[PDB]
Amino acid sequence: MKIGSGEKLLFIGDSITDCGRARPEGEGSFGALGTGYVAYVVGLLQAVYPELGIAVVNKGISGNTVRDLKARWEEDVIAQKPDWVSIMIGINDVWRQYDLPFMKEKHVYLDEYEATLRSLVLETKPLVKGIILMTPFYIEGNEQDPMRRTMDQYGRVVKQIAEETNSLFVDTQAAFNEVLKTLYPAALAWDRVHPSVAGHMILARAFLREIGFEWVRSR
């Protein structure tokens, strides 16, 4: 278990993280944590590690790119004084290039994405105990679909930033890919991005595996 007792864990990201969380505070009840992977992570940690004693905050905002995260970083992350910061961002950075290809101001291309995400992680690292970087993902099994291909490229950036900064790393793409050996995307997400309960469990399980969660603790 990487997270220690008494620590504040803060999750930030886009709609995948948001899932109807309470605005602005994003804390104070599960209602406040929204209805997806964040709530499931916290629930399972409480079910299996109730003594862990963690405080949890959800600052996900629907629609965000890393550019949006940067504009609110000071208030929504630094000022919350978390011990651990989990980030999952890139889906919209990429998706806008494909769904609104001619509105270029909505796009966050790979150069802006890497520089901005790198910079948020470098600035934040000295202020906290740890960072978890979760790749964006696209629920699509064909590596040569253009959006999947670009999303994998964004994920490489996240992975390389995690390496360089000694952050924990969750490859969310790899978690979906495993299930995508059996299921066509639409069985998890009609839109290849916003999934069912099952997709949120895929995410929660990937996160928990990386922080050293055990389903049944051996001690």
Catalytic positions, written as ranges: 15, 191, 194
**Is 101 a binder of its own copies (CB under 8 A)?**
yes
Q: Does 42 interact with its own copies (rule: CB under 8 A)? A: yes
Provide, rounded to whole angstroms, the least separation between the CB of residue 15 and Cl ion: 3
191's CB contacts (< 8 A; 6+ apart) are: none
Tokens standing for 81? 């004084």
Nearest-angstrom CA–CA distance, 203 and 134: 10
Residue number, 6 or 74, with CB nearest to its own copies: 6
Contact of 54 with 6, CB cutoff 8 Å: yes
- Find out whether 132 and 171 touch, Cβ atoms under 8 Å: no
Question: If we measure between CA atoms, which residue out of 58, 63, 135 comes closest to residue 100?
Answer: 63
Residue 190 engages its own copies in binding (rule: CB under 8 A): yes
Q: Work out what residue 48 binds among its own copies, Cl ion, none; the CB cut-off runs from 5 to 8 Å by kind.
A: its own copies
* 1, burial (CB in 10 Å: exposed 0-12, middle 13-18, buried 19+): middle
- CA-to-CA distance for 59 and 78, rounded, in angstroms? 12
**83 contact choice in its own copies, Cl ion, none (CB below 5 to 8 Å, kind-dependent):** none
- The least CB distance from residue 145 to its own copies, in Å, is 7
Site for its own copies contains 179 (CB under 8 A): yes
Binding stretches for Cl ion (CB under 5 A): 14-15, 62-63
Q: How far is the CB of 138 from its own copies (least distance, A)?
A: 10
- For residue 50, the one-letter residue type is P
Dist CA 83 CA 127 (whole Å): 8
Query: Contact between 44 and its own copies (CB under 8 A)?
Result: yes
Binding piece for its own copies, criterion CB under 8 A, among 70-78, 94-102, 120-128, 155-163: 94-102
Give 9's strand partners: 56, 84
How far is the C-alpha of 200 from the C-alpha of 159, rounded, in Å? 21
Q: Is 79 in the site for its own copies (CB under 8 A)?
A: no
**CB of 111 vs its own copies, minimal distance in Å:** 20
| CA Rg value for the chain | 16
Q: Work out whether 33 is an interface residue with its own copies (CB under 8 A).
A: yes
Positions touching its own copies (CB under 8 A) are: 5-6, 27-30, 33, 35, 39-40, 42-44, 46-48, 50-55, 95, 98-104, 106, 142, 145-147, 179, 181-184, 186-187, 190-193, 196-202, 205, 209, 215-216
